[PDB]
Amino acid sequence: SGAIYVGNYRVVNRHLATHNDWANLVWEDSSRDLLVSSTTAQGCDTIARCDCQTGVYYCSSRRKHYPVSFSKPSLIFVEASEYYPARYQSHLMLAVGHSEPGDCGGILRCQHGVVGIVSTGGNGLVGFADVRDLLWLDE
């Protein structure tokens, strides 16, 4: 679990969005596993606007943060799960690291701010849904 809170927006994994997220929907994209909802309170987070390929992510299944080198946002095949059919997920970045069911929503940060959230795992890999291209989150 986990979310980004920036301005009057909440960014979550689309497959973990609640009834309240859907009732306050701003934007969603199944191909990216992202959903953004509106909030009444002002958020706690800053979004990175950069091309960093290293950072640190939070892994809830270890209660620890790990440093990672990750690929640039790209179109990657993701196997079927209970939440999606087998498909290509866009704007996804991969790295070597631990991620299991439950770790989705953990934040990946570089020195400039939030980069994205955990969206895929298994096989000693961890995948992050990028949010750095969503410039409107800042306004």
Ligand SMILES: COc1ccccc1[C@@H](C)C(=O)N1CCC[C@H](C(N)=O)C1
């Ligand atoms: C079967 O899921 C796992 C198995 C081992 C390890 C980890 C997982 C989880 C985290 C995972 O990668 N996904 C399930 C939730 C939606 C994800 C997506 N973006 O399509 C895919």
Ligand SMILES: [Zn+2]
């Ligand atoms: Zn950066």
